[PDB]
Amino acid sequence: SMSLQPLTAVNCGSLVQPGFSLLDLEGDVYLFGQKGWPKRSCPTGIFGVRIKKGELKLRAISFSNNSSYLPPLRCPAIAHFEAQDGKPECYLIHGGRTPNNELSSSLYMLSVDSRGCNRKVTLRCEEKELVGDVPSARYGHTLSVINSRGKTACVLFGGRSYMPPTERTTQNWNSVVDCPPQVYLIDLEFGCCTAHTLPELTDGQSFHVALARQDCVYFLGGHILSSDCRPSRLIRLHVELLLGSPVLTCTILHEGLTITSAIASPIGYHEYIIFGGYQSETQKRMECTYVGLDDVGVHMESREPPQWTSEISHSRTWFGGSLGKGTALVAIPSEGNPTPPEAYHFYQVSFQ
């Protein structure tokens, strides 16, 4: 079953903002993307998350000497590169949006470097140069890793962006549009990107969930901005790395799941659990969903949700990320006078 326990943020509630990332590296979870530019208390901007005794504590992580430093991107595409040859195990980030609202259009590989001493870990970030046909600066898109024969590539798809520089006006400045619906194959070196268009992917989407397994990627419910619809349909994409041009085919599967901005926590070998973003523009999704996927296709079954508190049930918005091994963290904005100033109440939900 599933249980939620309320947490308490001891001395850092000023760092979490609706768009942030939680990276599970070697069992340790790292918060990435904080409000504002990195202060001097933590000049890196990446924190180690430790949950214990109903408390949520954050620790300042440092980098290595050969690493490039990193702006706190807000809604980047995040791909867990799993431990394999050559060097395990990266965490691909591209590209999000900057504290001053630009879009990065840069790829960053984030790995673990050394330990300890006293449970101290140093990370490292290689900003990997991209030669293409590079994809445009965007956010809300998704990035996934695929293995075929037995080469490893990275598929990139979706996202929003600002209007083209020709139509952009100081009165159009903050309006966003979906990028054209092409898929990008990023080799990780050679740092060569290729763009491929698909007859069945007729319009772009954003804030979808992408689940990859062994040379097949399944795109679940996204949000289409042109028609203002949340499609129930599921996309299944089959790639294959032929020397030397990547032939690539697509298909629409009948019914998937109507969600946007979800939390996909992994529980099993290739099985995840969806904790829910939003069904409609006014109604956040309150039900859980188990999604295991195999060689035959996707499977999907209802799980019973936990006893949602009145507060987390009547809240307008919510967000969070997976703490790993069937556990995730959710946040709720708080309203009070005076300011608490703890901006968010925190819960930890766990499956089994």
Partner: protein, 552 residues
């Protein structure tokens, strides 16, 4: 008889009358002696639309990059098309603004009487002289706390406000050629409210760098678009070409650090204008050159991001001199007179406190005796100098405290008769150099102090080094550093310091509160839209001339 709608509109605006109060008076004066003297309300609503932005036709050559060519836009919401999806960053903001160049056109066209008379007094003629106008614009921006929130409908909004404004300082002409430029109009009271025109209002906290940049992005884009084009305006019957120089100087130190990518504010790197560290500014107190610029901060944060030499955090920090955030707004490398005054006054307050008790002998005092010394100092400054103790140092207290007689009222408490001479000498040294950064033009109205500044600051620094080393062994106030090391070259490069202060903007905050309480609809959806317009009217030269001219 009957008054011109312009005259009575100026009457209504310049005397802080409400619309409801003005109507209350109009009907009354119209019922006794039935001949109506004041105009009704609707004709004033018709009278003002020539004074608000979005009325005159203009054009830029060449066209402005990514700025629309429409010239008739009025008040826009500053969200600028923020798509309101739920998965995106929220639209937490209520903000209103004028589109920058349109408001510029409006203020310039408002200055047309003075531009023409400035042309005629220099005995320059008019068929001539339509090609080389140069306008110098002082910009200003400041946050503002304690803004009570309405009940309204939505959305939930913070209780702080940010207020971006500007003012036209000078406007000159360069053609025929040899002349540097013949100034034709210049602001007589640049630190007044009546010459600080509002541009954009937001219910935003200063601190959230995410929403503030989202609001102020378009404005900075228009600024960067205007530096190349030339405006063309039919002023005095003829089409004339203008160019613009923007100098952002109305920022306190906190905002300058926030907007130039520097770390704030009690850092190891203290100066906004130089690269010297805190301890390094104890040894050498008076010898520092201005090196920092927006160009170079932009160039340096790329060093921070890419880290091309693969150094650790601290080696990188000192290689980059504390630039770890991307600078977002170009800021003139200068000083703020008002906040400098207040900072140096609070420093001298602490020095007096440390001289009542003799902390140069007993280096570690308790907390209760420091409080005791505070009490005795405040009681003495209440008996003489007629001051009450203040929760926080403000400008008027700073002005009355840094006088000769106040120091002499303090010396009556210091027992040792050589430290009395010491801080008395300190105070007159300080007074021999304050007018250089407080004057509107120092080279004209205090020239000898301007030339004697280097030597005076030298002696000030050495008095601190000798007779107060227990306090300034390795620590200095940032404003003390600026006051002692950078004043001459600033006044030589720009011409003045006090003329470009943040005084006028803070003065406009007063009007913000007044208007919010008495001159706007009481709703979240409309109050900013009203405060902006009425504030723009109150700061119009054309409406201000009706007050002065029909007296003298």
């Amino acid at each position: 008889f009957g008054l011109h709608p312009a005259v009575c509109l100026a009457i209504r605006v310049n005397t802080f009358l409400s619309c409801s109060q003005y109507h209350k008076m109009y009907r009354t004066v119209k019922a006794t002696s039935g001949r109506q003297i004041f105009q009704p309300l609707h004709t004033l609503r018709n009278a003002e639309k020539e004074l608000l932005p979005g009325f005159h036709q203009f054009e830029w050559q060449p066209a402005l990059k990514n700025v629309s060519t429409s010239w008739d836009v009025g008040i826009i919401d500053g969200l600028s098309g923020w798509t309101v999806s739920v998965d995106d960053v929220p639209a937490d903001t209520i903000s209103r603004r004028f589109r920058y160049d349109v408001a510029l056109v409006s203020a310039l066209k408002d200055l047309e009487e003075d531009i023409m008379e400035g042309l005629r007094e220099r005995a320059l003629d008019d068929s001539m002289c339509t090609s080389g106008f140069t306008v110098v614009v002082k910009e200003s921006c400041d946050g503002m706390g304690d803004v009570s929130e309405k009940h309204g409908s939505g959305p939930a909004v913070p209780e702080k406000a940010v207020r971006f404004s500007f003012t036209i300082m000078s406007i000159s002409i360069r053609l025929e050629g040899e002349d540097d430029g013949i100034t034709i109009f210049q602001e007589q009271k640049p630190n007044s409210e009546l010459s600080c025109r509002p541009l954009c209002l937001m219910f935003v906290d200063e601190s959230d760098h995410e929403t503030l940049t989202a609001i102020l992005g378009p404005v900075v884009a228009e600024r960067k678009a205007m530096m190349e084009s030339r405006l063309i305006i039919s002023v005095g019957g003829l089409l004339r070409s203008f160019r613009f120089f923007f100098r952002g100087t109305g920022y306190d130190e906190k905002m300058v650090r926030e907007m130039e990518g520097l770390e704030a504010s009690g850092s190891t790197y203290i100066c906004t204008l130089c690269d010297s560290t805190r301890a390094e500014a104890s040894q050498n107190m008076v010898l520092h050159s201005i090196t920092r610029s927006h160009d170079e901060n932009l160039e340096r944060y790329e060093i921070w991001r890419k880290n091309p030499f693969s150094e650790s955090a601290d080696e990188l920090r000192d290689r980059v001199k504390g630039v770890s955030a991307k600078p977002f707004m170009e800021t003139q490398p200068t000083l703020d007179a008002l906040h400098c005054d207040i900072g140096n006054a609070t420093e001298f307050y602490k020095i007096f406190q440390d001289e009542i008790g003799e902390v140069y002998q007993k280096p570690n005092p308790s907390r209760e005796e420091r409080r005791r010394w505070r009490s005795t100092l405040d009681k003495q400054l209440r008996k003489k100098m007629k001051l009450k103790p203040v929760m926080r140092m403000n400008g008027n207290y700073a002005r009355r405290l840094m006088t000769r007689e106040a120091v002499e009222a303090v010396c009556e408490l210091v027992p040792s008769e050589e430290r009395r001479e010491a801080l008395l000498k300190l105070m007159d040294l300080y007074l021999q150099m304050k007018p250089v950064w407080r004057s509107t033009c120092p080279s004209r109205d205090c020239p000898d102090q301007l030339c004697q500044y280097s030597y005076n600051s030298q002696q000030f620094a050495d008095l601190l080094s000798s007779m107060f080393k227990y306090r300034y062994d390795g620590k200095i106030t940032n404003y003390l550093h600026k006051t002692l090391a950078h004043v001459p070259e600033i006044v030589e490069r720009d011409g003045s310091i006090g003329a470009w202060a943040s005084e006028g903007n803070e003065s406009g905050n007063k009007l913000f509160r007044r208007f919010r309480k008495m001159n706007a609809r009481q709703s979240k959806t409309f109050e900013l839209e009203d405060i902006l317009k009425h504030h723009w009217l109150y700061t119009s030269k054309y409406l201000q001339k009706f007050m002065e001219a029909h007296k003298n």
